[PDB]
Amino acid sequence: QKDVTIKSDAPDTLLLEKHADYIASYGSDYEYCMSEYLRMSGVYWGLTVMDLMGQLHRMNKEEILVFIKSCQHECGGVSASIGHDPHLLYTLSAVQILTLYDSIHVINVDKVVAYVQSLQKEDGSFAGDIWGEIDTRFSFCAVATLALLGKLDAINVEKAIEFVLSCMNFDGGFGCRPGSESHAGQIYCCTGFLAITSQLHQVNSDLLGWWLCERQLPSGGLNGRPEKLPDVCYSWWVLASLKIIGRLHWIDREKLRSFILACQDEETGGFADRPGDMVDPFHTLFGIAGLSLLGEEQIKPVSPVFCMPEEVLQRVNVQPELVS
Amino acid sequence: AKRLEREQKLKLYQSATQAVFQKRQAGELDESVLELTSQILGANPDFATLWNCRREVLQHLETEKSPEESAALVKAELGFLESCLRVNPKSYGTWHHRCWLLSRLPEPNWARELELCARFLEADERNFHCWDYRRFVAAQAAVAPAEELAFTDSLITRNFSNYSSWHYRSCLLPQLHPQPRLPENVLLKELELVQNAFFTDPNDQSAWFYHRWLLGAGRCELSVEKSTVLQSELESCKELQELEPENKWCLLTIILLMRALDPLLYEKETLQYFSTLKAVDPMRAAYLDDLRSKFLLENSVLKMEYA
Numbered sequence: 001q002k003d004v005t006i007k008s009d010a011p012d013t014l015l016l017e018k019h020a021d022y023i024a025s026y027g028s029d030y031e032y033c034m035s036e037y038l039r040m041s042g043v044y045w046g047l048t049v050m051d052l053m054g055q056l057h058r059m060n061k062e063e064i065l066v067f068i069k070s071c072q073h074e075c076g077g078v079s080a081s082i083g084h085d086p087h088l089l090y091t092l093s094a095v096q097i098l099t100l101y102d103s104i105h106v107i108n109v110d111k112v113v114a115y116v117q118s119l120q121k122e123d124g125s126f127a128g129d130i131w132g133e134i135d136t137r138f139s140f141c142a143v144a145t146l147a148l149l150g151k152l153d154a155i156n157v158e159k160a161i162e163f164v165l166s167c168m169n170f171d172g173g174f175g176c177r178p179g180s181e182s183h184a185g186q187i188y189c190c191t192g193f194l195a196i197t198s199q200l201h202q203v204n205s206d207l208l209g210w211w212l213c214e215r216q217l218p219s220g221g222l223n224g225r226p227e228k229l230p231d232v233c234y235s236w237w238v239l240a241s242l243k244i245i246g247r248l249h250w251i252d253r254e255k256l257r258s259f260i261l262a263c264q265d266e267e268t269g270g271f272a273d274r275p276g277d278m279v280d281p282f283h284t285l286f287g288i289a290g291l292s293l294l295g296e297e298q299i300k301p302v303s304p305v306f307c308m309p310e311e312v313l314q315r316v317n318v319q320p321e322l323v324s
Numbered sequence: 325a326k327r328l329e330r331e332q333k334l335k336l337y338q339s340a341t342q343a344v345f346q347k348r349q350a351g352e353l354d355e356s357v358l359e360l361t362s363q364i365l366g367a368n369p370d371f372a373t374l375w376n377c378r379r380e381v382l383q384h385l386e387t388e389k390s391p392e393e394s395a396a397l398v399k400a401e402l403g404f405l406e407s408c409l410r411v412n413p414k415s416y417g418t419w420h421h422r423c424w425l426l427s428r429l430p431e432p433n434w435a436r437e438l439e440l441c442a443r444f445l446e447a448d449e450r451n452f453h454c455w456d457y458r459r460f461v462a463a464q465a466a467v468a469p470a471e472e473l474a475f476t477d478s479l480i481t482r483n484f485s486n487y488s489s490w491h492y493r494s495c496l497l498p499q500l501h502p503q504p505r506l507p508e509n510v511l512l513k514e515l516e517l518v519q520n521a522f523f524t525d526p527n528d529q530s531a532w533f534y535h536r537w538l539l540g541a542g543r544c545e546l547s548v549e550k551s552t553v554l555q556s557e558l559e560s561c562k563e564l565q566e567l568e569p570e571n572k573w574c575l576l577t578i579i580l581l582m583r584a585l586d587p588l589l590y591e592k593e594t595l596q597y598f599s600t601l602k603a604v605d606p607m608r609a610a611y612l613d614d615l616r617s618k619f620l621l622e623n624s625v626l627k628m629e630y631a
């Protein structure tokens with residue numbers, strides 16, 4: 001019953017020029033200086049959404065490559081920003097960016113692989129960094145990073161699969177760790193993981209697909225778990241997961257499209273989590289990426305596994321089979 | 325004033341952060357860093373590198389301080405963490421630091437940690453970070469499944485927002501009956517409990533989701549008690565259907581009950597219910613068509629089994 005009501009004057013058309021201006025100008029400032037701890041991922045979100053819109057050239061390639069090189073530590077891992085500490089999250093982000101730019105050899109790839117390998121535990125799980133936080137988010141970061149580098153064989157794949165499957169729940173979904181409640185974010189990470197490792201036959205697609213399509217609320221937006229408000233980000237995680245398991249048609253595509261469009265800020269550009277809220281780059285990528293999955297003609301096709309343009313993944317020959 | 329003060333904040337955080345990093349490069353692993361980071365992490369708990377700095381300081385001080393001084397530092401850290409959690413109970417970084425801290429203590433007070441969890445779950449019964457923390461504490465202290473099962477029951481009956489509690493039950497029940505499908509007596513008790521839940525509040529989806537799981541946890545293997553319980557649920561859902569004709573959960577559950585009882589005998593009724601349900605829940609029409617196609621194919625195979 002918790003939901004939003006979309007007002008009748010909410011945006012109902014795609015404002016592509018405004019979103020490109022919003023991202024191109026971003027970080028030209030309170031929230032910017034305060035979000036330095038996630039800068040590498042912020043850069044990934046910005047560049048990917050620009051590339052999906054055909055506008056990647058407006059960003060500063062040379063500046064970003066130097067920044068990435070300066071963020072790789074002696075252990076091989078990459079930090080969110082200069083002087084911050086290395087983490088799998090920002091290592092994935094960096095490798096995604098370099099793949100977008102066909103510039104993977106700007107960093108030491110052997111050392112990246114060594115770093116990823118070092119974070120796997122006896123049970124097949126992955127810690128995010130040396131301090132030991134375990135999350136299936138990090139299993140996805142590990143295999144997605146290695147897949148993009150052609151080095152999936154560097155980790156213990158069957159153990160990594162066993163751990164992820166040990167996180168499957170009564171409702172067909174997945175949480176952070178064994179016994180964790182199902183959540184759209186972790187379902188995206190685990191279904192993406194199983195796509196990359198060729199294990200989608202182990203998902204109960206009809207059951208999980210039902211849980212996922214029940215995320216759609218009367219407003220047309222999707223929540224991230226039962227009895228919560230809809231959000232553009234959870235919405236992308238749900239849609240991508242459905243696409244991976246061949247059941248994207250189980251949600252009402254026109255109603256979701258209208259919800260996503262209503263989250264645009266027509267003055268500043270950008271997408272917010274919900275209509276009327278303040279926009280950010282994170283929700284801007286997921287709004288645009290969601291629309292692409294729903295078949296919007298003005299946006300490039302997006303990979304539901306990697307959240308990057310399909311044409312980039314085609315180029316490097318990394319395209320996991322889906323259950324369609 | 326308001327927009328002006330958020331420049332004053334910006335510069336203090338900026339200068340504090342500057343200071344921490346300079347000290348860190350200088351190898352100054354001391355209590356001044358704890359002071360500087362406390363001023364930043366309260367407002368900015370997702371700044372992971374500053375949590376790393378606190379751990380490095382605490383690790384270093386443990387080497388060059390007395391056991392009594394180390395014990396004081398730990399108690400201060402527990403209170404700092406509790407204050408941070410009150411302000412933002414949904415930060416991955418804060419909950420991880422607490423797990424890191426408790427895992428290395430000599431004499432951890434796990435009962436105190438379980439009580440903290442109960443408190444936070446009273447405030448937000450859906451906080452997954454806190455449920456995850458509680459499972460961590462439960463493992464560390466060898467709290468047995470039956471004890472945690474008792475906790476879930478009190479939470480389920482006292483108010484709504486039950487998805488997290490029902491989920492916890494689904495993980496605990498199999499542990500009380502660890503098979504290398506629940507035993508029928510356990511299943512029957514669960515069906516009774518969940519049926520109370522969705523007849524009390526027919527709008528709470530958590531009960532309906534959990535019930536569907538129990539329906540999968542044989543048809544031509546149905547005992548007379550289970551056969552009779554499922555038939556009773558069927559009639560009870562039809563009663564609810566009258567009271568709430570737009571309730572889609574009861575309609576879907578009627579279809580699932582007929583499937584659990586006798587697919588071929590209830591073919592006609594099942595197809596009728598699909599038509600009504602699609603009208604009541606149109607956003608799910610494509611899912612419902614695929615479910616029906618799956619069931620029609622199953623029926624074809626059952627009809628072909630005929631001798």
Ligand SMILES: CCN(CC)C(=O)Oc1ccc(C[C@@H]2CN(Cc3cncn3C)c3ccc(C#N)cc3CN2S(=O)(=O)c2ccc(OC)cc2)cc1
Nearest residue numbers: 038089137140141185186188189231233273280281282370
């Ligand atoms: C599932 C994909 N993965 C694994 C590859 C992943 O790591 O995605 C993330 C999922 C959650 C996070 C935690 C937050 C999410 N949020 C907060 C949020 C999103 N939707 C609703 N909310 C409240 C945000 C929000 C905005 C931005 C931006 N720009 C970034 C995040 C990412 N992180 S966060 O801890 O760094 C964060 C950032 C800002 C913030 O206040 C605006 C609060 C948290 C980070 C990454």
Ligand SMILES: [Ca+2]
Nearest residue numbers: 057058059060
């Ligand atoms: Ca450029």
Ligand SMILES: [Zn+2]
Nearest residue numbers: 231233234273
């Ligand atoms: Zn969001």
